[PDB]
Amino acid sequence: MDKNELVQKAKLAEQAERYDDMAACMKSVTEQGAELSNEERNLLSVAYKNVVGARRSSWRVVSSIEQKTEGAEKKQQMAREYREKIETELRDICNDVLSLLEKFLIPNASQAESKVFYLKMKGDYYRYLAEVAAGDDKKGIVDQSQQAYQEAFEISKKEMQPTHPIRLGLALNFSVFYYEILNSPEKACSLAKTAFDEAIAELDTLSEESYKDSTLIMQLLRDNLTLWTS
Amino acid sequence: MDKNELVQKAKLAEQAERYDDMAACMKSVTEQGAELSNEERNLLSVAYKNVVGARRSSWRVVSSIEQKTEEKKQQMAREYREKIETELRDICNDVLSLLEKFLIPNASQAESKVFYLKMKGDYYRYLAEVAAGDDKKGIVDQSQQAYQEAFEISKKEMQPTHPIRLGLALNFSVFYYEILNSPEKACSLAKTAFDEAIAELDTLSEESYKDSTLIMQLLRDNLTLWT
Ligand SMILES: [Ca+2]
Ligand SMILES: [Ca+2]
Ligand SMILES: [Cl-]
Ligand SMILES: [Cl-]
Ligand SMILES: [Cl-]
Ligand SMILES: [Cl-]
């Protein structure tokens, strides 16, 4: 009921691996209208990542099965219908997150760190809608994802250090957007490489707190470069 | 809606790791009242094992947290445990109702009789893990009686290397160790099952050797742990 009580409840749900309970708790905290602490922001993000992620993973298995059944018209129809059922769940999750971002999280974000984080998150959830969209609505959704990422990108470039894990994480996800959604491997590689190289160049300005996360994300950036290069 | 379609939906749901959907499909298949095939009963078993399993795992983390508290936090942990318990009991009672109404009555073979009686033992055991005081003694006896009848039929009708007989021995030994706190009985049961399987090891066929030997390894791992 109370804010602090809902946060302790979310942490308990996290430990129980009951992420729908966790998402419900952090949604309620967000809806109280106060700016989320760094802890609360991370709890919200973890909760919804796991809720949407379960559907994404399932949709990837059912869509793959649907495509890899040629002659079975009845079996393919079942897979198609189950895929659509899963899509509807996924869309409702994404729309709940995107509504929270638009109504509470983005307008209340009083620091560049926070604003970049939430705009990146907006980019991610429009990207998850884009993964699942049919041709008519897809171009619009893809553009919404790109615009969110692009605004996040410009703010992080202006306000944040190249080694900042949120700036690096944005570069990772935006490069993935270009590769997987926009089919633009050259743009994806150049964004990823530039982010990696800028972090390498400013290796002095990197504190002992965000020293691990930063270097882990840099490794992921370069892993994508080597993968996409072949 | 038709059995064959529901079975295919269950398999789809399994691939998707959507186990509530899978359990719902196999529940409705069972409720048509025809004896389940080997494939169908295994789908039902996997579905509900995962559905109850999620609650059991959650109940193991929230119960522990409640234990290690000194406060408002304890009452929150208690109430969340109780909520998880309610879900868990409703799952177990669904499975146990399917077992009483459909599965155990229609079981035409000793193999399937043992399979379902073991299952009955398992789901009362999961209720026993979560019971306190009055109800527990009664819950524990139902588990034990299900296992005991299964055990007698398996010894009579199945070879020591049969995976269902071995799996029963494993779960019944775990019942003795974890529910009845009878470690000597648990070890004796597990040791006998392992040794008897080792002694008749030419009585396997190329199909079931992998499952049998995996359970044998789990039996011995428990013996090593429990010593
Ligand atoms: Ca859940
Ligand atoms: Ca599920
Ligand atoms: Cl949940
Ligand atoms: Cl969950
Ligand atoms: Cl499900
Ligand atoms: Cl599931």
Curated annotation (Swiss-Prot), chain B:
<dbReference type="GO" id="GO:1900181">
    <property type="term" value="P:negative regulation of protein localization to nucleus"/>
</dbReference>
<dbReference type="GO" id="GO:0140297">
    <property type="term" value="F:DNA-binding transcription factor binding"/>
</dbReference>
<dbReference type="GO" id="GO:0019901">
    <property type="term" value="F:protein kinase binding"/>
</dbReference>
<dbReference type="GO" id="GO:0070371">
    <property type="term" value="P:ERK1 and ERK2 cascade"/>
</dbReference>
<protein>
    <recommendedName>
        <fullName>14-3-3 protein zeta/delta</fullName>
    </recommendedName>
</protein>
<dbReference type="GO" id="GO:0005634">
    <property type="term" value="C:nucleus"/>
</dbReference>
<dbReference type="GO" id="GO:0000122">
    <property type="term" value="P:negative regulation of transcription by RNA polymerase II"/>
</dbReference>
<dbReference type="Pfam" id="PF00244">
    <property type="entry name" value="14-3-3"/>
</dbReference>
<dbReference type="GO" id="GO:0005737">
    <property type="term" value="C:cytoplasm"/>
</dbReference>
<dbReference type="InterPro" id="IPR023409">
    <property type="entry name" value="14-3-3_CS"/>
</dbReference>
<dbReference type="InterPro" id="IPR000308">
    <property type="entry name" value="14-3-3"/>
</dbReference>
<feature type="modified residue" description="Phosphoserine; by PKA and PKB/AKT1">
    <location>
        <position position="58"/>
    </location>
</feature>
<dbReference type="GO" id="GO:0050815">
    <property type="term" value="F:phosphoserine residue binding"/>
</dbReference>
<dbReference type="InterPro" id="IPR023410">
    <property type="entry name" value="14-3-3_domain"/>
</dbReference>
<dbReference type="GO" id="GO:0090128">
    <property type="term" value="P:regulation of synapse maturation"/>
</dbReference>
<dbReference type="GO" id="GO:0005925">
    <property type="term" value="C:focal adhesion"/>
</dbReference>
<feature type="modified residue" description="Phosphoserine; by MAPK8">
    <location>
        <position position="182"/>
    </location>
</feature>
<dbReference type="GO" id="GO:0019904">
    <property type="term" value="F:protein domain specific binding"/>
</dbReference>
<dbReference type="GO" id="GO:0003016">
    <property type="term" value="P:respiratory system process"/>
</dbReference>
<dbReference type="GO" id="GO:0005654">
    <property type="term" value="C:nucleoplasm"/>
</dbReference>
<keyword id="KW-0597">Phosphoprotein</keyword>
<dbReference type="GO" id="GO:0007165">
    <property type="term" value="P:signal transduction"/>
</dbReference>
<comment type="similarity">
    <text>Belongs to the 14-3-3 family.</text>
</comment>
<dbReference type="GO" id="GO:0031647">
    <property type="term" value="P:regulation of protein stability"/>
</dbReference>
<dbReference type="GO" id="GO:0042470">
    <property type="term" value="C:melanosome"/>
</dbReference>
<dbReference type="GO" id="GO:0042802">
    <property type="term" value="F:identical protein binding"/>
</dbReference>
<dbReference type="GO" id="GO:0140311">
    <property type="term" value="F:protein sequestering activity"/>
</dbReference>
<comment type="subunit">
    <text>(Microbial infection) Interacts with Epstein-Barr virus protein BPLF1 and TRIM25; leading to inhibition of the type-I IFN response.</text>
</comment>
<dbReference type="GO" id="GO:0031625">
    <property type="term" value="F:ubiquitin protein ligase binding"/>
</dbReference>
<feature type="modified residue" description="N6-acetyllysine">
    <location>
        <position position="68"/>
    </location>
</feature>
<dbReference type="GO" id="GO:0043066">
    <property type="term" value="P:negative regulation of apoptotic process"/>
</dbReference>
<dbReference type="GO" id="GO:0005829">
    <property type="term" value="C:cytosol"/>
</dbReference>
<dbReference type="GO" id="GO:0035148">
    <property type="term" value="P:tube formation"/>
</dbReference>
<feature type="modified residue" description="N-acetylmethionine">
    <location>
        <position position="1"/>
    </location>
</feature>
<dbReference type="GO" id="GO:0042149">
    <property type="term" value="P:cellular response to glucose starvation"/>
</dbReference>
<dbReference type="GO" id="GO:0008104">
    <property type="term" value="P:protein localization"/>
</dbReference>
<dbReference type="GO" id="GO:0008039">
    <property type="term" value="P:synaptic target recognition"/>
</dbReference>
<feature type="modified residue" description="Phosphoserine">
    <location>
        <position position="205"/>
    </location>
</feature>
<dbReference type="GO" id="GO:0006468">
    <property type="term" value="P:protein phosphorylation"/>
</dbReference>
<dbReference type="GO" id="GO:0070062">
    <property type="term" value="C:extracellular exosome"/>
</dbReference>
<dbReference type="GO" id="GO:0006605">
    <property type="term" value="P:protein targeting"/>
</dbReference>
<feature type="site" description="Interaction with phosphoserine on interacting protein">
    <location>
        <position position="125"/>
    </location>
</feature>
